[PDB]
Design a protein around this ligand. Structure first.
Ligand SMILES: [K+]
Ligand SMILES: [K+]
Lengths: 195, 195
C-alpha cells in the first residue's frame, strides 16, 4: 500500500542535484539509502546526509573510475581528497572527496589513503546485473546524464532509535523532506522496458 | 578561558557508562571526539553518538585485543559481530559489535570482515607515548578499571553545518548534555603526576 515514486521523478531529481531514497521492493521491512550523484555533493547536501543517516558514507563507482584511480581492482578501501580539505571527516571535506571521485580528471595521487570516504565498485550492467543499492546509485547518475558515481548512506530510524528506518517510516521522511522514494524492483522494471 | 573538566570527572563518568568529550589542548580550533568505553555500548549510547557525530565510528583497542583477534598486527580494517545483529549498521548492531570487541572471550571467528565498525590500535603507553584520541580512549577505559577498549567519533558543528565543532562549541554541547570536556594535555599531565 505504501506509495512509491517513479523512476522518472528519481532521475530528474538526481539530475537537479537532489537526493532520493532507494529501497529493494515494496516489503515493509526494507532499510533505505539516501542517494545523490557524487558530482552534486555540496557541504549542505553531505551535512543533510550525515544528520539523518548512519554517517558511514559510501561512494558507488563505475569500474572504469575505480580502475582509473587504482582502486578496487576487478580490508576496506577508504580515501580522502589530498588537497582542499582539513581532517577529512567534515561534511565539507567528505563533499570535496566525493566530487573528486566523480571528477573524470582526478588520478590516484589526488587521494590520500586511508581516509574517511568508502568507495564501492558497482557491477557493470547496474541493477540488471546486481540488484544492490550500489548499482542503483550509479544507474541513477548515468540515467541523469551525470558521471557514473553516487553517494549513499542508510537512513536512521527516528521512531526506534536503535534501528534503521523501514519502508513506512522512509515514506514519511521522504514526504517531509520533499524527496522521491523508489524501489530497485521498479528501477529494474524501468530499465528492462526502455532498453 | 574555556572551562575544562578534570581527569577525575572523566574517569568516573567513563566508569559509569557515560560519554566524555576529548580535545588536544586549550586551542580554540580543536575538533573533539565523543568517547565512551566499548563495553558500555548500548543501543541508546550509540544512537546518541551517531546522532551528533560524523557516524564514522571507531573502536580504539589495546594491542593485546588486536592480536587476540588477528586484527592490525604490529586498506582500512572493518568488522561486524557475526552473531546477534542484522545488517551491521544500526546503532543497536554497532553497539553489539563494540561490546564484542571489548569482550575478552571473543575470538577472530566471532567477527565478520568487512564490516561497519573501524578498530584502531592504540600505542602501548597511551597518551604518554602518542597524544592521540585513540590513546586517550583506551587510557580512560583502563583508568576506569574497564577493559582497554573505547568508542570514538568526532562531534559535528551545529552552528556551521559544513564543519566539525571547535572548542567553544564543544563546551556548549558538553554543558547541554551533562558531559565532561577534557584535553589530552591535561590527561598527559595527570598520568605523569600519578605514575
Ligand atoms: K550525525
Ligand atoms: K546521524
Amino acid at each position: 500500500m505504501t506509495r512509491l515514486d517513479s523512476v522518472e521523478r528519481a532521475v530528474a531529481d538526481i539530475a537537479a542535484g537532489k537526493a532520493v531514497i532507494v529501497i529493494d521492493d515494496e516489503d515493509r521491512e526494507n532499510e533505505g539509502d539516501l542517494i545523490f550523484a557524487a558530482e552534486k555533493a555540496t557541504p549542505e547536501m553531505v551535512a543533510f546526509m550525515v544528520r539523518y543517516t548512519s554517517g558511514y558514507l559510501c561512494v558507488p563507482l563505475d569500474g572504469a573510475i575505480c580502475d582509473r584511480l587504482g582502486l578496487l581492482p576487478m580490508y576496506t578501501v577508504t580515501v580522502d581528497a589530498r588537497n582542499g580539505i582539513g581532517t577529512g571527516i567534515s561534511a565539507s571535506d567528505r563533499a570535496t572527496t566525493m566530487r573528486l571521485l566523480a571528477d573524470p580528471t582526478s588520478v590516484a595521487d589526488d587521494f590520500t589513503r586511508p581516509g574517511h570516504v568508502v568507495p564501492l565498485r558497482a557491477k557493470d550492467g547496474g541493477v540488471l546485473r546486481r540488484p544492490g543499492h550500489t548499482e542503483a546509485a550509479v544507474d541513477l547518475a548515468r540515467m541523469a546524464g551525470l558521471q557514473p558515481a553516487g553517494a549513499i548512506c542508510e537512513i536512521v530510524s527516528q521512531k526506534d532509535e536503535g534501528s534503521m528506518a523501514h519502508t513506512d517510516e522512509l515514506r514519511v521522511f521522504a514526504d517531509e523532506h520533499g524527496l522521491a522514494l523508489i524501489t530497485i524492483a521498479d528501477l529494474i522494471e524501468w530499465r528492462r522496458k526502455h532498453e
